[PDB]
Amino acid sequence: AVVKCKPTSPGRRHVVKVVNPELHKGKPFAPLLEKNSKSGGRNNNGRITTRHIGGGHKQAYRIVDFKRNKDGIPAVVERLEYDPNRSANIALVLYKDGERRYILAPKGLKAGDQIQSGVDAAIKPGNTLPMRNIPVGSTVHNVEMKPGKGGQLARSAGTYVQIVARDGAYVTLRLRSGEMRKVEADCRATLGEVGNAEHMLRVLGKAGAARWRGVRPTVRGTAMNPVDHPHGGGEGRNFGKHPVTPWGVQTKGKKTRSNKRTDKFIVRRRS
Amino acid sequence: MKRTFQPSVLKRNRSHGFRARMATKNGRQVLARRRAKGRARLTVSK
RNA sequence: AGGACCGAACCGACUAAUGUUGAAAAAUUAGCGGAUGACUUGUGGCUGGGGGUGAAAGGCCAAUCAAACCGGGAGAUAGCU
RNA sequence: GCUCGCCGGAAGACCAAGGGUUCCUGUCCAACGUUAAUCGGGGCAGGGUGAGUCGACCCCUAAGGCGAGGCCGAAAGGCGUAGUCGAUGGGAAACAGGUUAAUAUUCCUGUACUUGGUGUUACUGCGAAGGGGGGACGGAGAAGGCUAUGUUGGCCGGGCGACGGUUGUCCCGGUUUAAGCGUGUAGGCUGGUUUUCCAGGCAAAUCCGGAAAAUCAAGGCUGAGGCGUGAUGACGAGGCACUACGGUGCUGAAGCAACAAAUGCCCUGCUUCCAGGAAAAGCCUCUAAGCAUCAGGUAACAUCAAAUCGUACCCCAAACCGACACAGGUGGUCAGGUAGAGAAUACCAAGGCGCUUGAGAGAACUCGGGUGAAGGAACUAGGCAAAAUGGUGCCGUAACUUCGGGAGAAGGCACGCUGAUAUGUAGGUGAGGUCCCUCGCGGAUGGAGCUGAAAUCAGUCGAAGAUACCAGCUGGCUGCAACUGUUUAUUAAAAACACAGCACUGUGCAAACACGAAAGUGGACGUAUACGGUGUGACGCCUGCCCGGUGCCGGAAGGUUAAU
RNA sequence: AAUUCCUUGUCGGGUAAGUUCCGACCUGCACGAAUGGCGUAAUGAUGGCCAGGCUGUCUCCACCCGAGACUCAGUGAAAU
Numbered sequence A: 001a002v003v004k005c006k007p008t009s010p011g012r013r014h015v016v017k018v019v020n021p022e023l024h025k026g027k028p029f030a031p032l033l034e035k036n037s038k039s040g041g042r043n044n045n046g047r048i049t050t051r052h053i054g055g056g057h058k059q060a061y062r063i064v065d066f067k068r069n070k071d072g073i074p075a076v077v078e079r080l081e082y083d084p085n086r087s088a089n090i091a092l093v094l095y096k097d098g099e100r101r102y103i104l105a106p107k108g109l110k111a112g113d114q115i116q117s118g119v120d121a122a123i124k125p126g127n128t129l130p131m132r133n134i135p136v137g138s139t140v141h142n143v144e145m146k147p148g149k150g151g152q153l154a155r156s157a158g159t160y161v162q163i164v165a166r167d168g169a170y171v172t173l174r175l176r177s178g179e180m181r182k183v184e185a186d187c188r189a190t191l192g193e194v195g196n197a198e199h200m201l202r203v204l205g206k207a208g209a210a211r212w213r214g215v216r217p218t219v220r221g222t223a224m225n226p227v228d229h230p231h232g233g234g235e236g237r238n239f240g241k242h243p244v245t246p247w248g249v250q251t252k253g254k255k256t257r258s259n260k261r262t263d264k265f266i267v268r269r270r271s
Numbered sequence B: 001m002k003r004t005f006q007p008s009v010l011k012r013n014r015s016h017g018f019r020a021r022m023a024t025k026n027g028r029q030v031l032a033r034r035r036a037k038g039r040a041r042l043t044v045s046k
Numbered sequence C: 001a002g003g004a005c006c007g008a009a010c011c012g013a014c015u016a017a018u019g020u021u022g023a024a025a026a027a028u029u030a031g032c033g034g035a036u037g038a039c040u041u042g043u044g045g046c047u048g049g050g051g052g053u054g055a056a057a058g059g060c061c062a063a064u065c066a067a068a069c070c071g072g073g074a075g076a077u078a079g080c081u
Numbered sequence D: 001g002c003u004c005g006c007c008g009g010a011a012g013a014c015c016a017a018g019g020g021u022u023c024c025u026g027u028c029c030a031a032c033g034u035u036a037a038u039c040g041g042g043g044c045a046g047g048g049u050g051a052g053u054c055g056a057c058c059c060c061u062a063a064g065g066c067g068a069g070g071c072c073g074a075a076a077g078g079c080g081u082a083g084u085c086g087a088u089g090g091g092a093a094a095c096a097g098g099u100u101a102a103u104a105u106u107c108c109u110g111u112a113c114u115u116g117g118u119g120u121u122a123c124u125g126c127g128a129a130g131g132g133g134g135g136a137c138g139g140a141g142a143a144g145g146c147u148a149u150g151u152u153g154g155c156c157g158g159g160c161g162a163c164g165g166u167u168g169u170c171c172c173g174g175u176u177u178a179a180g181c182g183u184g185u186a187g188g189c190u191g192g193u194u195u196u197c198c199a200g201g202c203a204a205a206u207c208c209g210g211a212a213a214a215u216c217a218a219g220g221c222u223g224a225g226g227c228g229u230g231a232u233g234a235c236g237a238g239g240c241a242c243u244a245c246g247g248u249g250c251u252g253a254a255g256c257a258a259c260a261a262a263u264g265c266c267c268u269g270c271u272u273c274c275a276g277g278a279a280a281a282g283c284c285u286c287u288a289a290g291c292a293u294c295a296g297g298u299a300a301c302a303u304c305a306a307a308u309c310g311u312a313c314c315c316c317a318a319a320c321c322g323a324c325a326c327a328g329g330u331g332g333u334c335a336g337g338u339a340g341a342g343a344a345u346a347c348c349a350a351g352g353c354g355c356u357u358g359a360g361a362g363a364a365c366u367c368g369g370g371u372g373a374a375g376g377a378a379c380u381a382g383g384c385a386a387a388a389u390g391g392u393g394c395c396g397u398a399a400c401u402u403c404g405g406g407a408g409a410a411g412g413c414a415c416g417c418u419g420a421u422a423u424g425u426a427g428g429u430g431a432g433g434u435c436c437c438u439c440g441c442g443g444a445u446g447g448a449g450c451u452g453a454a455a456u457c458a459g460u461c462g463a464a465g466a467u468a469c470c471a472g473c474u475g476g477c478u479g480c481a482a483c484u485g486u487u488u489a490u491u492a493a494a495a496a497c498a499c500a501g502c503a504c505u506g507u508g509c510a511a512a513c514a515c516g517a518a519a520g521u522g523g524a525c526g527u528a529u530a531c532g533g534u535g536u537g538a539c540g541c542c543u544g545c546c547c548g549g550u551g552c553c554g555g556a557a558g559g560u561u562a563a564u
Numbered sequence E: 001a002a003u004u005c006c007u008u009g010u011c012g013g014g015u016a017a018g019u020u021c022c023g024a025c026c027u028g029c030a031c032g033a034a035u036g037g038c039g040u041a042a043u044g045a046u047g048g049c050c051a052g053g054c055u056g057u058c059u060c061c062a063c064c065c066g067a068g069a070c071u072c073a074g075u076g077a078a079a080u
Helices: B009-015 B018-022 B025-037
Strands: A002-004 A016-018 A075-081 A090-095 A100-104 A143-146 A150-152 A161-167 A170-175 A180-184 A266-268
Touching: A143 A180, B009 B018, B018 B025
Parallel strands: none
Antiparallel strands: A002 A016, A075 A090, A090 A100, A143 A150, A161 A170, A170 A180, A180 A266
């Protein structure tokens, strides 16, 4: 759900956050935790690499699995908790001999069901099998499109992948980005959707609410000193020339894809 | 009032100290130029 | 509960006055104010010259800066003094 | 020597950085302290710095630096995986008595304990650079059980009085007590006990992570305070011994619980919350390796040993720094009584100082504070500045509004003392008995008792009772700016800037993009509910046309056309 | 009007008078929808205009207190 704050003091009325009464809490599982450290855009080799970054309150990384290697063993969901690294939230899983793993949340917000993987697996969430099994026209979840990179796509809150068509050794997938791609039917999929799906509804309401996440204020190129951005300070409200990067180059509408190695797998292109 | 240099033999020995200078090409050259001018001290922290 | 009302410690610049060859390389006296925050702070680090840092004044970068400081080319050049 | 004064959250006490012979007695007075100087942090000597346990070291290591093998680079230099430094973090070891001219958790006394060996006594599987639990981390709120702290009474010792009162109508001061070691209570967490089992924890596992059968729920872990023990030792007002009323010792009264509790404990707690909040080793525990009346592991002890660094002194300052013994700058710990909400604020407490030019005088004028008649904002660019208001229980309140606010609107009452309200209400705390048991630092039910606001009304008193310090000016029109914020050290502070949200554009991820002459890292261990580029500016209602030029995309058939 | 000469436009309101204030108007020499448009409260180290209390800002100061102006001794400058 989403909930809105009362006007107790100025501006606070705008604040809207995601709340879930079934969402659990506790301590992270230490063998799948690392402190990960802040990067701050300040550079090991010289001058800064990134912009609009500074400060932010302490965070750690919970290590999530997209390899799903323990085949033919039933595992149980133990708890679903708030995650600081991805908006989908992350669940804790216990395997039948004692191993514990963190997984991308299946839909249902619930724990206690048992899941398997193979060439054939139950129709339920969290169970994984190859897309060659299914008659298409459905949701496939996170998909192992390239074995050497694990389960790809649809990792953020409420994200989804539609399987559109099939023939022989291949199938086609359509994405909420505007791109459509072709893959081998033998590629592993977990089926269904990602949970949460409310993260885009959040309204910060306050000018400090991104500051505690390390987000630095944005100063305009046409307002800062003429040597410190290619646009340069006014000359009030008169931008002058065509928009460019801080590095002096035109960008608007100019396509920058140069990959050339995966375009044969893209059957309909993002506009 | 407050000074731009406050007294500290720890941070003086870290920047201008003998081994600290010697451990850098340019600081070892400052010491070589101390010997060229004939300066009686090579450290002013010890 | 709180980028909340007043308010010690803590912080601090806005008005007024004194100071201005001073106690003074920026303080003093009185008041208004900042005080759970987009805050403040003890301790040690990291960011450098057209480079840093800046909720961004070409302000700040050890009093210096439309380009710091020292040492060199350099006793450069001056139809002038 | 007597007396006075000021500071007393400092003008005091302790710790540290940084400095460096500053400490003390013994003298000296040329120079120094912009003086007098007999003083002195000055001159010049002599004496002084006693540690197993205190701060450092130990052992682990954050940010960061260095960096092999390896890589980038003519090279100075640098990247990055081990490794090694490094805490501001995590990890073994002493208290409070009185002594010296000057020292001290460093001496001497009393008492305590950790580390290591050896001996004593009972029980015993100990153990990786590996496995598990811990170490271990946010913000805030609220229950329980307390303690420094302080007064009354008890108790002790002293006094009873220069004018009147003061032997029950009191005055004065005490009543001290640690480290530790038990007892293991409150608070916190957590089910015991035997049996067996294992496609996880890189091999093994008796530990965790899980399962299965039976018996039974108070067994176990953690931890304030008290109480006992340490402690009839130390301390003690007050006596007394002797040469020396010269100092230097001896002795020694009472030594309690009733209530309020600090910024301190139990607390790395419990509870709640979104920003979901270091690692490792010591420690405990599992097994591998290895090993045997050993060694190692546990409870209680006797006895021997305990490297090294540091140590003199000052400090919101004459010992630091500001060229100075300079109205300045400056880290950590502490804050009693009376009054008071109080850390505001005063008299004060313990404690400290009375100055590194002095004497005097006193006019126009210079600086601040004090007094203010009648008038009052006329002054001035401006109520700037200054004065008045000022406390909080009970009353009473407009427009506008995002319904929260505006608002302490506006406008009013009351305040000492005593009596009468409640001879003291609210708030907090509370004996025995009833009670439930398991015995017991019982548990739990309750309301005799204790402590104790803020308030009211009458009557009398003053100029005045929120008596001092402390302590809100009120109302209306209006441009512009959402609000909290940001804005340049000593003339330029807001309408400029940022922000919640709005749009366009690049990006399918080994992204696009950036820095790096790179090795590499950042983008991000983020994946389209996610990132790069540029403008807009919360919130409510909202968005006309133009593609010639200059950019960009779709098409590549045609034209133009280069090196070749 | 943060955009406007002559302009204090032109009219109304406040006022003994009012280039200021408040409100309208169009004939903007030249506002205009993201180089955004328009409006609303608490609010503003915001600016303009009025009312009341209170008051040495002022009529106009007059007298005090603590420290300098004076003087003597000690130690005794600088700019020029």
